């Protein structure tokens, strides 16, 4: 592992220090369908005409990014995603900008969001949840070794591919930081207590977030929920969580160590690092090398039907991609 990560860091740093820029143009793609939309911008299925390859294209309105004060965060996302390469991450295949928008082109995962399948099916079995969890543990090990914090783990950001493996996407809050950081960001249900309490925090917030994800996957609902964020925050800082009776002893023990308010005891954050997690009894049946190699049989595989098939995604109102005749926010996004 240490060896693999050493070389991964060398690979990453070359691209980190000399980012790829302006590697395609909008006219090289045929837009097909909107796969998601919100404050994060929009993500569309597109076809690259020269190859006929399908991709997911994230489109950000530069003016909207500025109003949301997400300039630096958006520059983080692009700079990080063009530099990484990992089986369970969506790296950038291309990026470019025009007068109005920023564009990031990534591998398309046709299986839909984990969120969709989790909600519909209700909950995942422990083996099913563990298969996904293993991929997140490996991804965080990778990211963290590059001094990257992800900061938005949730089912909504985990895409299922044709083989039933997952891709972490949306790096809008991801940041390369060696010390502590302070930004209040994330999704309410997944926020570590130290974020809520406005403390300086570190990569340990990703491991807390993993605890929330594993709980939600296995229970079908998150460990801290309420109708409004403030009441969710009250539950998170309180220091208490209940587990469904169907949770195995080993699962409960893993989650008590992930959802640990005390940073000196939170798994992932201790002296032995990620191995406290990898060597936990709940992961005893996990062949970590086989997960990484994608040789493990996925416990759920999505309906095939086609290469640019979108039936595993919800339907969103389709909005124009408008391009102003005037360049907006040129200085703000000069490095993009």
């Amino acid at each position: 592992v240490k060896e693999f990560l050493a070389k991964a860091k060398e690979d990453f740093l070359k691209k980190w220090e000399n980012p790829a820029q302006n590697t395609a143009h909008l006219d090289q793609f045929e837009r097909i369908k909107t796969l998601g939309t919100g404050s994060f911008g929009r993500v569309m299925l597109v076809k690259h005409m020269e190859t006929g390859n399908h991709y997911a294209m994230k489109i950000l309105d530069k003016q909207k990014v500025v109003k949301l004060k997400q300039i630096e965060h958006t520059l983080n996302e692009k700079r990080i995603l063009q530099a990484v390469n990992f089986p369970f991450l969506t790296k950038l295949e291309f990026s470019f900008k025009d007068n109005s928008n920023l564009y990031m082109v990534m591998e398309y995962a046709p299986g839909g969001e984990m969120f969709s399948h989790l909600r519909r099916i209700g909950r995942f079995s422990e083996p099913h949840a563990r298969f996904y969890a293993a991929q997140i543990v490996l991804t965080f090990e990778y990211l963290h070794s590059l001094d990257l914090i992800y900061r938005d783990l949730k089912p909504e950001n985990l895409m299922i591919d044709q083989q039933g493996y997952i891709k972490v996407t949306d790096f809008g809050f991801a940041k390369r930081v060696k010390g502590r950081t302070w930004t209040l960001c994330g999704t309410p249900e997944y926020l570590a207590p130290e974020i809520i309490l406005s403390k300086g925090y570190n990569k340990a917030v990703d491991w807390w977030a993993l605890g929330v994800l594993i709980y939600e996957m296995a229970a079908g609902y998150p460990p801290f929920f309420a109708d409004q964020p403030i009441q969710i925050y009250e539950k998170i800082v309180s220091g208490k969580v209940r587990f469904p009776s169907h949770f195995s002893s080993d699962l409960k023990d893993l989650l008590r160590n992930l959802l640990q308010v005390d940073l000196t005891k939170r798994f992932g954050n201790l002296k032995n690092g990620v191995n406290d997690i990898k060597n936990h009894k709940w992961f005893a049946t996990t062949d970590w090398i086989a997960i990484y190699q994608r040789k493990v049989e996925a416990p759920f595989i999505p309906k095939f039907k086609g290469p640019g098939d979108t039936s595993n995604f919800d339907d969103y109102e389709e909005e124009e991609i408008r391009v102003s005749i005037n360049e907006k926010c040129g200085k703000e996004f000069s490095e993009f």
Binding site: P188, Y221, F225
Partner: peptide, 20 residues
């Protein structure tokens, strides 16, 4: 049940990142 309370809540749909 906890499941029943979750399903009746306003937070079973896609959750947005926090702003400020």
């Amino acid at each position: 049940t906890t499941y029943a309370d979750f399903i009746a809540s306003g937070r079973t749909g896609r959750r947005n990142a926090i702003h400020d």
